[PDB]
Amino acid sequence: KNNDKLTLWTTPAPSPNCRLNAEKDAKLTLVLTKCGSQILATVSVLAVKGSLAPISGTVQSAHLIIRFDENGVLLNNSFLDPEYWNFRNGDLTEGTAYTNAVGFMPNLSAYPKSHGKTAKSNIVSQVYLNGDKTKPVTLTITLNGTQETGDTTPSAYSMSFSWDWSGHNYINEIFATSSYTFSYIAQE
Amino acid sequence: NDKLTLWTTPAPSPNCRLNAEKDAKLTLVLTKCGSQILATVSVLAVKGSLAPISGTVQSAHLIIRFDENGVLLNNSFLDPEYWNFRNGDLTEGTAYTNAVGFMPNLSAYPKSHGKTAKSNIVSQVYLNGDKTKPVTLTITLNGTQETGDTTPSAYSMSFSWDWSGHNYINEIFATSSYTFSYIAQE
Amino acid sequence: NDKLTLWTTPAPSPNCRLNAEKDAKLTLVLTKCGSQILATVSVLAVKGSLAPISGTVQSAHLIIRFDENGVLLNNSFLDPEYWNFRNGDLTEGTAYTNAVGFMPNLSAYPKSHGKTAKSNIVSQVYLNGDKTKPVTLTITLNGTQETGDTTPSAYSMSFSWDWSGHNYINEIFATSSYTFSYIAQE
Ligand SMILES: [Mg+2]
């Protein structure tokens, strides 16, 4: 059992695995590492096709919402593909889908279902396009909720990533973000 | 039951004093990862001049002080009732007698060396989780980013929120969650 | 011993080269949390053109390089004497022979892909812990954001501090503490 039940990830070098505008138009690298009562996370994203590859016209943001059921399992019609979202085995994922990941879900006491507009449910910081300090992008992570254009979409748990560069002209650049570290309180 | 997390609980009642007793809810979670502590912090004001922000208020400050065993001092500006080791989403019932493993390391962050760069963690957080409303957070370990706090303590953690130059009048003072780490005493 | 933390010690003597040998004190602590390393970094210059900042100086750079076993190369710009696994507030005296579990993952951060966004962590730190004195810190894993470091290594970690546009002349170069994490090789 080369398994590691304390890390849930996309793999460190994913194939296209998520939908920012269309199916598999980006590679999300997301690693969740369980440190008891807190999850330690790293996230980065790279667009591979469409209006973010390269950034065209008037687009100044990108959004991904990941939704899980009561067992911490991705919902049907997930915008993150489930095939390579699993517990760690070396640099790969287990092949058999997990049945329970509640230990990696954002705590519902800390981050209640209807509370996405609450300050505590948001982690907000700058990341940098192409790892370039002169090209800031704001990242807003929302736990068990959304601040955007209205979400009472059923899920038990959720994690929302919103990248925004209002005011910046990044036309003809590929949308790709520096790696960002964060933590949140675990459900169990 | 979990002796590797010391917290306020994830959903505290008013539990700290920014300008008067119990005028805010501090959510502070400390998770021991051996030689480093992994921490998350958020604050929400519930009454007074921060709820909502009034007049000329452009900052808020909290100092938490501990004794040599890592126990909150008397006259604490963080209420000790629900500051304890984790049990579910609650605290253990019996007050802890030792948390030295969660205290900021005195070799790394010496007592009253708060003006030293290394004893400070400084970053932007965001009012109401709103990217257009930045607030600077300065965290100081075993000191204050200022001349002497003269109340003795073995260890301390100081939080200073500042929004000089911004007009947030009539907004409730509430901060996005912020992750940091620091070197543990043992 | 504590084989889950690799560090400079929490209060190092001068131990790294920004512009000359031992012209700075780097505090760097790496704590293994399975698949991720939790890190804290701070730097303090002690002599030369950064102590205090003089003339035209608006940046500082350090590259740390390791072999296939995770051991510092010869001609290291971080001194190997006090870079080791934790023993109290000190280091083990006998040099480590393997630290591959602390190295940046090659699948995530491929060798010489320093211009790739994912291999960079970028944020503001603050001179003297002062919120009015920002400094950008760019961390690069297994590469350098300034291209083509030509010195071969199995693994590397690059730190670039930049304050273009700011006049910090006559200040000592000293940074607030900064937390980050990265995917571990094993
Ligand atoms: Mg910033």
Numbering used by the authors:
A (entry chain B): 394 to 581
B (entry chain C), C (entry chain A): 396 to 581
Question: What text does the study give?
Answer:
The shorter HAdV-C5K DG loop does not clash with the CAR-D1 surface, whereas the extended HAdV-D26K DG loop forms a partial steric clash, with surface seen to clash with the aligned CAR-D1, and HAdV-D48K DG loop is seen to form an even larger steric clash. Our modelling studies indicate that the longer, inflexible DG loop of HAdV-D48K would be likely to sterically hinder the HAdV-D48K: CAR interaction at the β-interface to a greater extent than the more modest inhibition of the smaller and more labile loop of HAdV-D26K, which in turn would exhibit more inhibition of CAR binding than that of HAdV-C5K, where no steric inhibition is observed. While the KOff of the three fiber knob proteins are similar, the KOn is fastest for HAdV-C5K, with HAdV-D26K KOn being slower, and HAdV-D48K exhibiting the slowest KOn. The IC50 (the concentration of protein required to inhibit 50% of antibody binding) of HAdV-C5K is 7.0 ng/105 cells, while HAdV-D26K and HAdV-D48K demonstrate IC50 values 15.7 and 480 times higher at 0.110 μg/105 cells and 3.359 μg/105 cells, respectively, reflecting their reduced ability to engage CAR. While still low compared to the known CD46 interacting HAdV-B11K and HAdV-B35K binding energies, that for HAdV-C5K was higher than expected for a known non-CD46 interacting adenovirus. Furthermore, interaction between the DG loop and CD46 is integral to known CD46 binding interfaces and is prevented by the HAdV-C5K HI loop laying between them.
Here, we have sought to generate high-resolution crystallographic structures of the cellular interacting fiber-knob domains of species D adenoviruses HAdV-D26 and HAdV-D48. We next calculated the amino acid variability at each position in the aligned adenoviral fiber-knob sequences, which revealed regions of broad conservation corresponding to β-strands which make up the main fold of the fiber-knob trimer. Each monomer interacts with two neighbouring copies to form a homotrimer with 3-fold symmetry and a highly stable interface. Analysis of the adenovirus loops reveals an intricate network of polar interactions which stabilise their three-dimensional structures.
